[PDB]
Design a protein around this nucleic acid. Structure first.
Ligand SMILES: [Mg+2]
Ligand SMILES: [Zn+2]
Lengths: 93, 263, 221, 40, 104, 13, 1113, 77
DNA sequence: GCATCCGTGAGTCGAGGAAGCACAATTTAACACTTTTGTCAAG
DNA sequence: CTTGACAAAAGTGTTAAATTGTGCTATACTGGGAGCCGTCACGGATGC
């Protein structure tokens, strides 16, 4: 099973809301090149390569780990979509 | 009206139905212009009505219209949209898809519940666009088109392609499907494990849900592409998450024949 | 005349057209019965209609008569030689001006198209149309490489001057879509024909130099 | 499938149809068995 | 905008003519020798559009610069060839013919 | 229902 | 390796020729060897005498004789040149001018009749084909009860298929007997009057039954003349036609009295005479002679119907599924029927040609056009449902295909329109149709096999042999008899004990009309020849069949057909006795014609010096590719100077070992679970099988390419392909074809071809690219033939056919065709399917090294590990008994013949196991070894399970286990024994034709369909997987809205979406939001073509254009 | 009123789902005359048009959910 | 109310791919001559 | 930045073959031909 899947299901009122949050956060991480992550350097997902350990390229894996931390805020009608993207682009060029 | 590779022409049956209607319509115009008797005009009008009927719905009224030299009825507009082979059930409610494979299944007892054994050569073809990007990122190929030429010939594939493919599939999942898909557990998402060989390795605990034995069954492989498609498969459709039966609520991934016997 | 590509009622209505023509031209002064003179026009009208409406791809009457004569000659030789004639025997029997090449071309012309809905196998779930690819629309691979080439060519043209890039993109039809000429581009910039070919040759030489030093553009060729 | 209250947005109509028809093959056919279900 | 509803209705003779880009007057499909579509036929380029992108039948216009233009020599619109999947024609019946769906 | 029979009957009048 | 034979039943007669159902019927149809004056009126000779003489009504075209010539090309040439193996047909016809009285005779060429090879198949367009026999209702007169109304019966008169309409006679509730023809009902009183029947005749004949005759005594029409009654009947049958005497008599005569349009058949006429107790002069319902109609069958049919309704003892209803009421149409009858249809078309052409055009100067050559005849014959052998692609995976596959009986085809049942009744095993199937062998699935009971001893008679009714029993002694007189004849006798069973020839048992198990009964020896009238006559050839090859469930024996017999030939194929240790006959009757091996001495032996030919002195050279078929791709080769089994007797084996065919059918390998088997690799029918094998090349087969693939004439120019098969390096062209010879012996892998070039590019201006970016690099665009492009994905091997053969070559009839515009044969040697691998004769099948899931497999205490590892959990549910205990006998045979070095239902019993197997233990354990004692410590632990456990007797010595307890087929087995991984004794033995396992190499397929992108623009399907076309309705439901149930939308749009038919998706992935980006599918656009336009205005609206009901402005005027 | 599953499905309000099930000619001939408008409510209609089905992650209850981290949230506020 | 007829429906994947002829009207293939680039020196 | 000279290359005007379209045959002919055939269920439809 996915790590912490039981905790993830308990954090939302509908299991399909969990998928929407994770999939949207995965797109945000990909769009900004993982520079907007809420994960500390000791917490970043890693993959084992022949050269050595590198950052995990799977943004769905990152979003699940981030959402377990509790530093992400999700909901409906939080901020305007245009205003949200413009601020996030400014913070993370 | 397409020309096949051999130079022969292939056409649909609607062209014959349209041609008859036009031939009869033009002939009626000529007969009307010549002041033909009513019997001739009436017969021509009756044929014109029947030509419209055949084009719209062939075989509904009277003898079906067949192409001369054969007894196969011509396919009309109504036949195109109706039936099990019509537009709705064959092309709208179900489709053939890209990024899909198929092979024989064998049992993988060493796998985890969320894992499957995907052959390397199926995985190379299924994840080809992702692989070409990864090959370009590393020094394997200068660009994507050069990378694609490398994979065309089997003897030109180097040993670093398999390392890149291992990197491509990390974290991703694929959908395994066995027909008939009687219930929703006939499609399940698994984390692929690249294996040497040509057969898909299936976990023993999911055989009951798939209704699969190992006397020659085959399964289909599908690759969800976007983050939404991956997130849905990894969260909702993963095998390790669907352990109870939706019909009754009882366990559906549970110890089976040999496992019960040993315990 | 049934079984030659037209249905029975279609033959009747085409025959009626010949009958109308016969009435117009019939002369009772000659004391011949009407059925004698009408039979010529009815058969003519039916035969012409078969020559015009029995094929999805229409073949002119003169070519249809050639095909009919060629089929008869092959049939006569086939029953006389006790085997299927080759193109040489058919051509020789047809007469002067006919060789084996012409017989093969005529037979190739006389090939009817095959239906896209013909079943294959006992199961009625497979047809010809399911095995014919569409080769008109570009594939996803072809579309991608065209965009990749356009992106790479645009980057290569950046190293060129502002005017040198414009000349090549006008002469090669990268702007208006259609190739321009030395004079037409010359009117655009107010320069004569001779100068443009010199600067274009110079700009083309620079692109060869840059491509040689990078080799980032040879794969698309 | 989860032993917890159903989440809003689930296609229970499809799940109901699949649940009923999946064991349809196991029903005896020989007013009894699958013919009884079909008339009902 | 976004498709929210799909409506089905009867088509008047006026609407059928408004759909059509031209009347199909001949049963000819393509030429037997040149394999090109025949004029006024079931595959006419002047009705259903060009076979290849931005190219008329007579081959006078062959580039996108003349987009949305109709060649005066041949009458074929200079546009994308994919419009051939979407453009309909029509047949003007000499006498009215009933629709079999609303009869049988 | 048979167009040929219907035509033959009509011309027989 | 001696062979020990079991059994007590002495078979009095051998098996009939196994392909005589095909071979004998076609000889009768053609009659090519009997002189023309001695030909009987059957086959095409009857068809000639039926259509001819052709009369214009004063020109007559008469038929005198026909003849068949030698085939133009031999069989091997036809296969290589894609020809049909056929013989020219000539007919001697004479034209008679009845006016003048002049006869002109000449021989006309009527075309070619396809010839049957010696094995019973045809070569149609270079491909082997088999015509499958068809079972249908026999023609005749039948009396079935009315289901709607009890106590009433309906008479049905059935002619030959497509040889007349079905006739129904029913007594209506009013009392009027109604005759139904062509779905039209009318009173039989009218037609009976047309036949010249008065009131006194009917009262005299049919008046002895009751009020039924009073229902046939309507005097409103009896006073009416037969001429006027005939016109009244003609009006009722066809209303509208102008009533004319000449037209009316023509229709009625053609309906029931015309031999050329109504044919009751030889079988139908025989059944009618047998049932109604009359004698038919011909094969028609009535005869028209002397300008009047004479009745043949209506009165006897009505007499039987009336008497049956009344309840006379001698009359009974007819069981339509009774196998005496069902007949077989063989290849000879099916061909003749199509020959007659084509001959009628030729006669129609002659009639319409002899009334117009130089009537005085006519010849039989000018009138006769044989094109309708050749078209009908070629249609039957190519586009018939019964004309099937020959199944030749192994010799048994081809033997089975020729003995198959199909209820489908033109003139038969429909797959979905067939009820349980046609699919059931009728009681009369005993000895005539195999009860077990049938295709499981939608065709169960619709395709069947002929039983081993059964034969089809002249009339098409299956017969089975029975031994005559008189006075309680069984004689050697064997009588072949049909199901209807079999119902009259008490037939005993073949296992009845006999003391010499006298029946010894006081109680004899017998059958009376299919019901099992117990009788005395003096009540027995016939006896079964053998238990083998109940089953087909495939089912007779299953040892210990009596211990297997029928559902699993069906799988066993079907899977034997799918077994591939092996380079080290070996005959089973336990056989039934038919292995030698199958190879002999399949004509795959080579046998000596008579006594002689072998002169030359080679891998290519064998030369034998016979006793009479003649030298005969036999070329050996080497590495030939069958229809299925398997390699079929013959290997010499004789040496130079060896003396051979008549019938001695010279060379093994495919899948035969010294003349014994060898479909697999004999391997050491342990029946035990192993680490979950045996799970759910999976099989574990050892690597030692691969080391010694067991289950290794040779498969050949054929690749074809054509050079065509095109408007742009001719395609060239050449080595000079543009833009190719020398590495890609290394294996191609100067002619552009790959050299023989080269190893080819996917993507390699087999045949190099260049095609002229279509005239089209290049894109500006490409043109700038060419300008930068200074490369001139060529006029030709690569269209060469390459090895497909997943394929390859060794090039063994190249065939090059060119236009104008002798016998090469290339299609117009094709300059040449090149065929490449690539052979690969396939070893057993994971995913390959194995099976035994008892229905146990599975795929190889694990290949273990030799040091990991369980082994015997002497150090011998087992080869295959089978899961015991596949036995109890399937109830196929024959594999267990085969394994026990195999274990005994493995240590005694011998093979066994145990016939089905009369063979090895457990006491005989146990005495063989006692001998095998003596050599297996006595060897250990002599070598100086006692009982293992590990064996002692297992014996201690075994006595706790009750497997051995307490208090015995270990040797005695080890022997007790051995007599049960169990041994102490060690684990190769730990060295410790398995805690329980394991059933280990030697079992015969087949490698089936289903291989994962031919089934693995994947695809990212590829060809798309023309209209829907969706991916094509199939591995051959590099197609996608069908995501049907049920798969969509699963995604909907999961709630995967975005996964479902991608498969509907981005991955199937969203042209803009799929192009943007691929471009996004290779750029490292996420795929874009999809758009409207192209199939929905096809839906809208197709709905608009029906004059329906379909419009897509938005939230505010405003139209939304889904065609991007491309369809708006 | 009680009706079977076949009759209940064929009498549904959406002509697209009814036409794709059975009686395509009958369903379409009645829909065309009535000028019926399909609101795309169920699952089959959305599948036919290739839209996002109104179930699971395509349902309006959860479809518009937004995710944002704390630092960006303060920047917007 | 009741037979009778007409229509519609009946699992999924896969793998198999038979006139001629004359004459007129129209289109097309060849040249022959301009007009227009393309490419040189001259600057 | 041009300025004349040349050399193909595409455009234009006749010109004939080659192809294609159409009219015309005068003893007397006057209503077609293959269908033939093993389910069973429902709902509905005038009809009576
Ligand atoms: Mg299975
Ligand atoms: Zn144009």
């Amino acid at each position: 099973a996915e790590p912490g899947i039981d905790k993830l299901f308990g954090m939302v009122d509908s299991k399909y809301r969990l998928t929407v949050v994770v999939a949207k956060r995965a797109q945000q991480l990909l769009r900004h090149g993982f520079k907007n992550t809420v994960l500390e350097p000791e917490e970043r997902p890693k993959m084992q390569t022949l050269e050595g350990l590198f950052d995990d390229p799977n943004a769905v894996t990152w979003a699940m780990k981030e959402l377990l931390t509790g530093r992400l805020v999700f909901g409906e009608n939080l901020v305007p979509e245009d205003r949200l993207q413009k601020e996030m682009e400014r913070l993370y060029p | 009206m397409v020309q096949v590779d051999g130079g022969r022409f292939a056409t649909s049956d609607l062209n014959d139905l349209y041609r008859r209607l036009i031939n009869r319509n033009n002939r009626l115009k000529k007969l009307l212009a010549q002041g033909a008797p009513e019997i001739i005009i009436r017969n021509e009008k009756r044929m014109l009505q029947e030509a419209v009927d055949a084009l719209l719905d062939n075989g509904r009224r009277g003898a079906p219209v067949t192409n001369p030299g054969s007894d196969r009825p011509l396919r009309s507009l109504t036949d195109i949209l109706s039936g099990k082979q019509g537009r709705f059930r064959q092309n709208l409610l179900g489709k053939r898809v890209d990024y899909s494979g198929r092979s024989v299944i064998v049992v993988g007892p060493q796998l985890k519940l969320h894992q499957c054994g995907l052959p390397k050569r199926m995985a190379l073809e299924l994840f080809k666009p992702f692989l070409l990007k990864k090959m370009e990122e590393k020094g394997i190929a200068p660009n994507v088109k050069a990378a694609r030429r490398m994979l065309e010939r089997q003897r030109d594939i180097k040993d670093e392609v398999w390392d890149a493919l291992e990197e491509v599939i990390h974290g991703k999942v694929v959908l395994l499907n066995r027909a008939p898909t009687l219930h929703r557990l006939g499609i399940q998402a698994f984390q692929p494990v690249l294996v040497e060989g040509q057969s898909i390795q299936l976990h023993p605990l999911v055989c009951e849900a798939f209704n699969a034995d190992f006397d020659g069954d085959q399964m289909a492989v599908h690759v969800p592409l976007s983050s939404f498609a991956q997130a849905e498969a990894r969260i909702q459709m993963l095998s390790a998450h669907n352990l109870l039966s939706p019909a009754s609520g009882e366990p559906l991934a549970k110890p089976s024949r040999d496992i019960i016997l040993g315990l | 005349y049934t079984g030659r590509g037209l249905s029975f009622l279609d033959l009747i209505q085409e025959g009626n057209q010949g009958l109308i023509r016969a009435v117009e031209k019939f002369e009772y002064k000659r004391r011949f019965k009407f059925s004698t003179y009408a039979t010529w026009w009815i058969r003519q009208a039916i035969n012409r209609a078969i020559a015009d409406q029995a094929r999805t791809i229409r073949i002119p009457v003169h070519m249809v008569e050639t095909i009919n004569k060629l089929s008869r000659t092959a049939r006569q030789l086939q029953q006389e030689l006790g085997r299927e004639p080759t193109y040489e025997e058919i051509a020789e029997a047809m007469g002067p001006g006919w060789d084996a090449k012409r017989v093969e071309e005529t037979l190739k012309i006389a090939q009817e198209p095959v239906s896209l809905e013909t079943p294959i196998g006992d199961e009625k779930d497979s047809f010809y149309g399911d095995f014919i690819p569409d080769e008109h629309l570009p594939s996803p691979v072809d579309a991608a490489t065209q965009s990749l080439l356009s992106e790479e060519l645009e980057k290569a043209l950046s190293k060129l001057s502002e005017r040198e890039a414009m000349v090549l993109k006008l002469r090669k039809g990268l702007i208006d879509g259609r190739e321009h000429t030395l004079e037409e581009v010359g009117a655009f910039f107010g320069v004569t024909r001779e100068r443009i070919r010199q600067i274009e040759n110079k700009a083309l030489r620079k692109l060869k130099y840059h491509e040689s030093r990078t080799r980032k553009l040879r794969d698309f060729l | 499938s989860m032993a917890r209250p159903v989440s809003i947005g689930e296609a229970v109509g499809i799940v109901a149809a699949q649940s009923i028809g999946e064991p349809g093959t196991q029903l005896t056919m020989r007013t009894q068995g699958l013919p009884r279900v079909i008339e009902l | 905008k976004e498709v929210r509803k799909v409506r089905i209705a009867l088509a008047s003779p006026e609407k059928i003519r408004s759909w059509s880009y031209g009347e199909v007057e001949k049963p000819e499909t393509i030429n037997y020798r040149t394999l090109k579509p025949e004029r006024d036929g079931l595959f006419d380029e002047r009705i259903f559009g060009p076979i290849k992108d931005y190219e008329c039948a007579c081959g006078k216009y062959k580039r996108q610069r003349f987009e949305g233009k109709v060649c005066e020599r041949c009458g074929v619109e200079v546009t994308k060839s994919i419009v051939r999947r979407y453009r309909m024609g029509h047949i003007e019946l000499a006498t009215p013919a009933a629709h079999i769906w609303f009869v049988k | 229902s048979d167009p040929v029979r219907q035509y033959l009957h009509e011309i027989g009048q | 390796m001696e062979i020990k034979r079991f059994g007590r039943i002495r078979e009095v007669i051998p098996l009939p020729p196994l392909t005589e159902i095909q071979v004998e019927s076609y000889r009768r149809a053609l009659q090519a060897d009997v002189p023309p004056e001695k030909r009987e009126n059957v086959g095409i000779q009857a068809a000639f005498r039926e259509t001819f003489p052709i009369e214009e009504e004063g020109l007559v075209l008469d038929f005198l004789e026909y003849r068949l010539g030698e085939p133009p090309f031999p069989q091997d040439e036809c296969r290589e040149k894609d020809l049909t193996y056929q013989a020219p047909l000539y007919a001697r016809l004479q034209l008679i001018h009845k006016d003048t009285g002049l006869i002109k005779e000449d021989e006309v060429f009527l075309g070619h009749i396809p010839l049957m090879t010696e094995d019973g198949s045809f070569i149609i367009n270079g491909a082997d084909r088999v015509i499958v026999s068809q079972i249908h209702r026999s023609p005749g007169v039948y009396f079935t009860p009315d289901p709607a109304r009890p106590g009433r019966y309906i008479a049905s008169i059935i002619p030959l298929p497509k040889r007349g309409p079905w006739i129904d006679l029913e007594v209506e509730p009013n009392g009027v007997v109604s005759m139904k023809v062509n779905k039209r009902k009318f009173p039989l009183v009218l037609l009976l009057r047309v036949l010249g029947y008065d009131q006194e005749t009917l009262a005299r004949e049919l008046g002895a039954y009751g009020e039924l005759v009073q229902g046939l005594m309507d005097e409103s029409v009896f006073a009416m003349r037969p001429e006027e009654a005939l016109i009244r009947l003609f009006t009722l049958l066809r209303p509208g036609d102008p009533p004319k005497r000449d037209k009316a008599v023509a229709y009625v005569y053609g309906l029931i009295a015309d031999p050329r349009r109504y044919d009751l058949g030889e079988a139908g006429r025989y059944k009618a005479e047998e049932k109604l107790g009359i004698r038919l002069s011909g094969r028609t319902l009535a005869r028209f002679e002397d300008g009047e109609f004479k009745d043949e069958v209506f009165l006897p049919t009505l007499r039987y119907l009336f008497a049956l309704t009344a309840g006379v003892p001698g009359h009974e209803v007819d069981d339509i599924d009774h196998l005496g009421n069902r007949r077989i149409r063989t290849v000879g009858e099916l061909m003749t029927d199509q020959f007659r249809v084509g001959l009628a078309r030729l006669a129609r052409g002659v009639r319409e040609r002899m009334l117009m055009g130089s009537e005085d100067s006519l010849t039989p050559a000018k009138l006769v056009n044989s094109r309708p005849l050749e078209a009908a014959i070629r249609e039957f052998f190519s586009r018939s449902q019964l004309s099937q692609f020959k199944d030749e995976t192994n010799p048994l596959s081809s033997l089975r295909h020729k003995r198959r009986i199909s209820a489908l085809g033109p003139g038969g049942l429909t797959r979905e329109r067939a009820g349980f009744d046609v699919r059931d095993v009728h009681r009369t199937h005993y000895g005539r149709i195999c009860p077990v062998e049938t295709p499981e699935g939608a065709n169960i009971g619709l395709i069947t096999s002929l039983a081993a001893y059964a034969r089809v008679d002249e009339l098409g009714f299956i017969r089975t042999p029975y031994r005559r029993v008189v006075g309680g002694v069984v004689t050697d007189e064997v009588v072949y008899m049909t199901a209807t004849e079999e119902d009259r006798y008490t037939i005993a069973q073949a296992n009845t004990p006999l003391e010499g020839n006298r029946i010894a048992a006081e109680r004899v198990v017998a059958r009376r009309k299919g019901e099992p009964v117990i009788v005395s020896p003096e009540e027995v009238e016939f006896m079964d020849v053998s238990p083998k006559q109940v089953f087909s050839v495939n089912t007779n090859l299953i040892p210990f069949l009596e211990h297997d469930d029928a559902n699993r024996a069906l799988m066993g017999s079907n899977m034997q057909t799918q077994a591939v030939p092996l380079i080290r194929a070996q005959a089973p240790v336990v056989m039934t006795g038919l292995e030698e006959r199958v190879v002999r009757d399949s004509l795959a091996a080579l046998y000596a014609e008579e006594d002689g001495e072998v002169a030359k032996v080679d891998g290519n030919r064998i030369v034998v010096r016979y006793e009479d002195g003649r030298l005969v050279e036999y070329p050996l078929r080497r590495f030939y590719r069958s229809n299925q791709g398997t390699a079929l080769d013959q290997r010499p089994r004789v040496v130079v100077g060896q003396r051979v007797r008549k019938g001695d084996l010279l060379a093994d065919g495919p899948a035969s070992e010294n003349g014994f059918l060898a479909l697999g390998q004999n391997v050491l088997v342990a029946i035990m679970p192993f680490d979950g690799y045996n799970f759910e029918d999976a099989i574990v094998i050892s690597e030692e099988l691969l080391k010694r090349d067991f289950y290794t087969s040779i498969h050949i693939e054929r690749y074809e390419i054509e050079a065509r004439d095109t408007k742009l120019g001719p395609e060239r098969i050449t080595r000079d392909i543009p833009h190719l390096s020398e590495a890609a062209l290394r294996d191609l010879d100067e002619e552009g074809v790959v050299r023989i012996g080269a190893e080819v892998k996917p993507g390699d070039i087999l045949v190099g071809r260049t095609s002229f590019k279509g005239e089209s201006e290049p894109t500006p970016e490409e043109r700038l690219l060419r300008s930068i690099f200074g490369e001139k665009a060529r006029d030709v492009k690569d269209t060469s033939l390459r090895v497909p994905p997943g394929e390859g091997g060794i090039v063994v053969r190249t065939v090059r056919l060119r236009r104008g070559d002798p016998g090469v009839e290339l299609k117009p515009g094709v300059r040449e065709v090149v065929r490449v044969y690539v052979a690969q040697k396939r070893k057993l691998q994971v995913g390959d399917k194995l099976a035994n004769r008892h229905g146990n099948k599975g795929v190889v899931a694990k290949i273990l090294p030799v040091e990991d497999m369980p082994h015997l205490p002497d150090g011998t590892p087992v080869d295959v590990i089978l899961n015991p959990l596949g036995v109890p549910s399937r109830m196929n205990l024959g594999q267990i008994l085969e394994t026990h006998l195999g274990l005994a045979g493995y240590f005694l070095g011998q093979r066994y013949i145990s016939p089905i239902f009369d063979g090895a019993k457990e006491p005989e197997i146990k005495e063989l196991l006692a001998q095998a233990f003596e050599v297996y354990f006595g060897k250990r004692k002599g070598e100086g070894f006692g009982v293992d410590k590990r064996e002692v632990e297992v014996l201690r456990r075994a006595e706790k399970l009750g497997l051995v007797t307490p208090g015995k010595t270990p040797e005695e307890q080890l022997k007790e286990l051995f007599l049960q087929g169990k041994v102490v087995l060690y684990d190769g991984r730990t060295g410790e024994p398995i805690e329980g004794p394991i059933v280990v033995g030697q079992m015969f396992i087949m490698k089936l034709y289903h291989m994962v190499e031919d089934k693995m397929h994947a695809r990212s992108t590829g060809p798309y369909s023309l209209i829907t623009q969706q991916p094509l399907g199939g591995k051959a076309q590099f197609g996608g997987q069908r995501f049907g309705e049920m798969e969509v439901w699963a995604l909907e149930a999961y709630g995967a809205a975005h996964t479902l939308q991608e498969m509907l749009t981005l991955k199937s038919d969203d042209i803009e979406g799929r192009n943007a998706a691929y471009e996004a992935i290779i750029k490292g980006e996420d795929v874009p939001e999809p758009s409207v599918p192209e199939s929905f656009r096809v839906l809208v336009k197709e709905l608009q073509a029906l004059a329906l205005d379909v419009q897509t609206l938005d939230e505010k009901d405003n139209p939304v254009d889904i065609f991007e402005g491309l369809a708006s005027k | 009123l009680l009706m079977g599953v076949t009759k209940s499905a064929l009498s549904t309000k959406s002509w697209l789902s009814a036409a794709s099930f059975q009686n395509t000619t009958h369903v379409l001939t009645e829909a065309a005359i009535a000028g019926k408008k399909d609101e795309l409510i169920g699952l089959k209609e959305n599948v036919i048009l290739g839209r996002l089905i109104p179930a699971g992650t395509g349902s309006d209850f959860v479809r518009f959910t937004q995710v944002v981290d704390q630092k960006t949230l303060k920047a917007i506020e």
